[PDB]
Amino acid sequence: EARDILKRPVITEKSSEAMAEDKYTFDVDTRVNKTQVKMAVEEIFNVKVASVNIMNYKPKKKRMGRYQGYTNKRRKAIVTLKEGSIDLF
Amino acid sequence: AIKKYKPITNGRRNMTSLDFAEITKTTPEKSLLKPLPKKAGRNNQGKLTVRHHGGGHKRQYRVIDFKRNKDGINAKVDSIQYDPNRSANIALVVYADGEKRYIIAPKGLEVGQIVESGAEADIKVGNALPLQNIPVGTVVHNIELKPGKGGQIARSAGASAQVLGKEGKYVLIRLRSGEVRMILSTCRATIGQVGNLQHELVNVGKAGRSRWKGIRPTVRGSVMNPNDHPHGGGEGRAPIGRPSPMSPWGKPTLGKKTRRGKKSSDKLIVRGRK
Amino acid sequence: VKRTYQPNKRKHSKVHGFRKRMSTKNGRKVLARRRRKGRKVLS
RNA sequence: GUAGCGAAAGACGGGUGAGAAUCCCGUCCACCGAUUGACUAAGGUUUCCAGAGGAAGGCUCGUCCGCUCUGGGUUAGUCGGGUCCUAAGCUGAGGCCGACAGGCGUAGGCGAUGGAUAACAGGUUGAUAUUCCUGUACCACCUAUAAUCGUUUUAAUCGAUGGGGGGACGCAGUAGGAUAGGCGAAGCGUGCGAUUGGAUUGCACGUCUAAGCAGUAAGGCUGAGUAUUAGGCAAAUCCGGUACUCGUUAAGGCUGAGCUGUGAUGGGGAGAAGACAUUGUGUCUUCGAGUCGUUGAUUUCACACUGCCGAGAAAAGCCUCUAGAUAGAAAAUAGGUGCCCGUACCGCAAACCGACACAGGUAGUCAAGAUGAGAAUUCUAAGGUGAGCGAGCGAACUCUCGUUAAGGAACUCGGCAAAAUGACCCCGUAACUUCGGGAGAAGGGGUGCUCUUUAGGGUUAACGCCCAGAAGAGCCGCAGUGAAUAGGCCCAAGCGACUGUUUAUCAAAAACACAGGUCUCUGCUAAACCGUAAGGUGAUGUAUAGGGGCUGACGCCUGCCCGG
């Protein structure tokens, strides 16, 4: 743990408008809580977290050439650290 | 007394009611109440077994002391009260230590009156005694069939039974039906007649009032079809085309007796009617 | 005008549904049938 | 190349484009308006937002789309749910019954549609917001902080698997007391018309949350204190009976109580344009512009009070008191810490149920102005929409609508349908009645505008401010509730007493119910009924009760036959 509950960052215009502030958006494991998320980012990036909000996204239906299905459900977190930065690109 | 309403409405023409004058407290005691949900004539299988029971006004159950065990501790009558679960009114009494109970209200009971239970007690209205210690000739109510179980006979409005004699360990007693019976001399009973005597004189006036009291309608067999009743059928109005009137479940219902033989009480009964 | 099947998720999953089928021996038989037939959904 | 293209007002200009009645923008016009409006549940499940697209779908077209492709979008200590309580019901170890399967049932457990429970204003996106940002608060847990109880029995506090109170409740009606909304006007802001006239003259405006300081408008109170104990499975300093002192005063002693004034906030935004070089001058970096004053006032105080019978949940949270418990807690500060699920979008519908982008159905909340008793009626703000095939001609026939000379039911099974009546005020009104009624009986009459007033509801201060007390005097018209909306009436026979209910989808009735009668059964493990039984209903009822049969308000009555 502490490096497997965080999987990917999210890069969008909204996430970048957030990164203009101290807000950073991640995609995490579907079974973990915001407390685990906070402890994990503090352990990894060596920063101090203020708040962490979180949401669950449903599976989206998809089609591709007579083969329909569902995407994977995903859990998104938004952390709002007090001071510090993260060298993303 | 009984009040007659004026005939402002065709549903109020010949309709009567009670005054509720002998009621002196129109609010019950919080502690002696329990819930009473409606069964609507439906058993543990959820099936309708008795007809004509349904949804009337909501009620709470007043817990009554039919067994007058509190011996040697006189109690003072605190109030008379209305009971929806019953035709007779009830009396809230308070014992010397503060324990309070409900009893059935007899005819000539009054607030402040004193009432006691036991063999040492005296023959006054409201008092409970064993039948051994009650003298012959007097009227009683709330009689036990088995000692310590509680009153089962003479509980309704205006009900009374009178002692007639004394056997070895039994006493002869005459009931409101005209039946005489043998009751154990240890079985308890209360002195006096039950109150609310005018309860039998009300004219209910309108169907909605029966619906409030929880009576659904009854529909006659002669206007059913044959698959539903023995009297069903006929091209128009028809008479009872059988030798005897019959129930909906295929049994005689006029004059045929239904008590079953080989009961223990068959010998304790000496003269019976109805 | 009013039509049959006024849907309800709770009642659907309560009168149908896996636990309700498994609560009775005959409801355990419809599952065995759907498994044997190869049904993708059992409840 | 026929029937049909699913209720409804569109017109023009400009633009985009290969291509336009159908797409975008603009002006005008029109429609819904107790709704074609705005929210919230259920249900649906990405239909949401940007770009791109015209093969298929769209009842035409299509540059458009709830369609296709690509990529994005749902942020909570306080919102609704679970970590709380229980109702009906469902399961139910032991246990009962039973060919098997299995059925029932005790403690218990599960279970909201109920109870308990801490957050408000402003800003901001293409798409979320009481969730993000700002500000100001509130509610719990933990840790340090130290003045207070200092055997720890007791003690504020710990305190029961303990107790008592409370939560905790119906229906209708009445009266008030505040408040949202709403309102005349010179506080003050604002711009002055072009077709004649006028210039107090047109039109508007006057604000603002949760929380915390003070009090408060009325409501309830055998209202305050002493003594004792057959009790609260054991304990109690709390509950209950009784004997006394101030006694029915309500001072204000007491619990509860709508709401009001300062700060919150000289912050926000502000009828503002005066601020632009720009942000297409739309907008905004800068600096103020009213927080005045009358009239009448849903919801809330609380089922408060009053009355009525049909006599109107439970448990927990909570409040007090406890034997035993422990040093020993607290609070008031400062720190921290506050998990999980949902949140997009449609939502009285093009996304739900209906085979459909179906004239149907779908629980709840809010709902302005004029007219009026009114949520009726007609028009209209705000908001939403112009409805998803069109252009012409104005034949027969069919449907919907209006008007028709003379006559007036002659039509027809039948005055079916249509016509007529219709509001408010006044005058008057029969038979017959169970004395309630009938009765809105029938039948007549009146209603506009202007000036006088003597004067009523008074706006009342008073004629003025609205209706008038409504009395006179006038004016106009074919017509004065000038539109819309708003009872046809009488006489006499049957049936059924009445209100009600009935064949979802050809029968709403004289058929069923009914309240009242009567007969019969049943002495309580009652009879009766369900079930193989166990267990249940009847009934936590007990002959003034319960079941069954017939009859069917009320009044006068209810005859003969017991041979079968």
Side-chain angles (χ1 to χ4, degrees), chain A residues 1-65 67-86 88-89, chain B residues 1-199 201-274, chain C:
Chain A
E1 300 290 321
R3 221 162 287 257
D4 211 331
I5 76 196
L6 269 61
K7 317 204 293 183
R8 322 184 295 91
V10 177
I11 314 301
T12 57
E13 47 260 309
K14 190 172 177 167
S15 86
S16 296
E17 292 161 17
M19 288 162 55
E21 320 190 2
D22 294 2
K23 284 181 192 291
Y24 298 87
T25 301
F26 294 92
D27 210 77
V28 308
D29 187 88
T30 53
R31 300 164 292 172
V32 308
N33 59 41
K34 49 175 69 173
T35 308
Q36 293 164 284
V37 171
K38 163 157 63 173
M39 292 174 64
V41 312
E42 286 189 356
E43 169 168 330
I44 289 160
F45 302 94
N46 191 5
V47 301
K48 284 177 185 170
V49 179
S51 311
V52 41
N53 296 25
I54 207 167
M55 55 258 275
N56 289 322
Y57 259 92
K58 290 186 189 172
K60 189 188 288 185
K61 196 189 263 59
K62 275 184 80 192
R63 266 80 67 196
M64 183 264 191
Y67 276 166
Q68 66 127 58
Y70 288 90
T71 349
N72 297 5
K73 55 154 171 167
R74 69 204 192 83
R75 190 158 216 230
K76 195 207 291 183
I78 293 154
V79 317
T80 316
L81 49 86
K82 301 161 178 155
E83 87 304 359
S85 66
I86 306 179
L88 302 179
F89 311 91
Chain B
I2 275 158
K3 58 170 72 173
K4 296 161 180 294
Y5 299 106
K6 310 287 276 186
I8 63 183
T9 316
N10 281 15
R12 227 162 160 83
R13 305 206 77 95
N14 286 292
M15 164 160 151
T16 59
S17 185
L18 297 172
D19 58 44
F20 305 115
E22 62 199 340
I23 311 309
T24 178
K25 174 157 168 57
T26 192
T27 292
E29 200 69 15
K30 222 194 183 192
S31 44
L32 299 168
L33 261 45
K34 287 194 172 294
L36 197 295
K38 307 277 186 173
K39 309 268 69 138
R42 279 163 173 81
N43 67 341
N44 59 352
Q45 308 179 351
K47 290 173 55 163
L48 192 146
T49 59
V50 311
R51 311 184 299 176
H52 314 146
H53 287 244
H57 210 285
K58 183 170 169 183
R59 303 175 179 170
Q60 292 208 268
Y61 183 75
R62 282 74 168 166
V63 48
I64 314 294
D65 186 65
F66 293 113
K67 27 180 168 193
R68 300 277 290 280
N69 314 319
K70 221 76 178 294
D71 298 326
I73 300 158
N74 52 19
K76 188 171 74 179
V77 173
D78 175 86
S79 61
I80 310 305
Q81 289 188 28
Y82 182 88
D83 196 350
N85 319 106
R86 197 168 285 97
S87 61
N89 308 131
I90 53 176
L92 187 270
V93 307
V94 192
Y95 286 87
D97 92 305
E99 176 166 6
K100 36 181 80 206
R101 296 187 176 182
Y102 282 117
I103 65 184
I104 289 156
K107 186 172 159 292
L109 201 80
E110 301 181 346
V111 175
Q113 185 173 339
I114 303 296
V115 51
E116 41 166 9
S117 305
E120 193 183 13
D122 55 354
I123 283 63
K124 310 222 81 79
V125 164
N127 291 338
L129 294 99
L131 285 165
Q132 193 158 25
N133 301 285
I134 289 165
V136 54
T138 181
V139 293
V140 302
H141 75 272
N142 198 44
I143 326 187
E144 308 186 338
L145 262 300
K146 306 183 178 157
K149 178 160 179 190
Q152 288 184 84
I153 312 304
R155 271 164 43 159
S156 174
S160 60
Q162 51 174 336
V163 176
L164 292 187
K166 203 165 265 59
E167 230 75 343
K169 57 176 182 181
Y170 286 85
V171 313
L172 278 292
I173 192 169
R174 181 180 283 147
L175 269 34
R176 194 71 177 74
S177 55
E179 160 165 317
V180 311
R181 206 189 189 282
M182 300 162 67
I183 304 290
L184 293 170
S185 301
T186 64
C187 287
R188 267 147 169 274
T190 52
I191 306 298
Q193 178 177 14
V194 181
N196 213 34
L197 320 198
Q198 298 181 288
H199 173 85
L201 297 181
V202 304
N203 188 315
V204 176
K206 63 187 228 187
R209 201 168 174 199
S210 302
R211 302 304 307 272
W212 301 340
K213 284 132 90 292
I215 315 312
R216 294 204 75 245
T218 107
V219 37
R220 298 165 288 114
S222 63
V223 300
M224 298 189 188
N225 296 317
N227 58 317
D228 299 305
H229 207 285
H231 298 172
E235 88 301 33
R237 279 202 250 280
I240 290 147
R242 304 172 75 103
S244 46
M246 294 283 281
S247 345
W249 305 278
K251 292 184 182 181
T253 186
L254 214 77
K256 187 162 210 309
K257 284 179 175 295
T258 45
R259 186 187 177 81
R260 54 195 65 161
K262 301 171 178 157
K263 297 190 88 194
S264 307
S265 171
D266 290 314
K267 66 193 293 189
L268 302 186
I269 289 159
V270 3
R271 200 167 186 280
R273 206 71 60 74
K274 276 72 70 177
Chain C
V1 73
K2 194 179 189 178
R3 301 297 189 194
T4 59
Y5 187 58
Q6 305 301 321
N8 193 336
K9 289 192 273 270
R10 171 164 180 178
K11 183 160 199 297
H12 190 50
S13 299
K14 207 154 276 276
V15 310
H16 319 307
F18 189 72
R19 294 188 65 75
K20 187 63 172 195
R21 299 294 190 203
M22 296 293 285
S23 66
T24 62
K25 193 189 276 288
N26 285 306
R28 292 184 221 116
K29 268 158 69 70
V30 311
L31 303 177
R33 285 192 240 117
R34 291 179 86 75
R35 282 188 183 114
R36 191 179 174 188
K37 200 183 201 209
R39 245 58 154 77
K40 174 159 192 68
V41 311
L42 313 179
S43 45

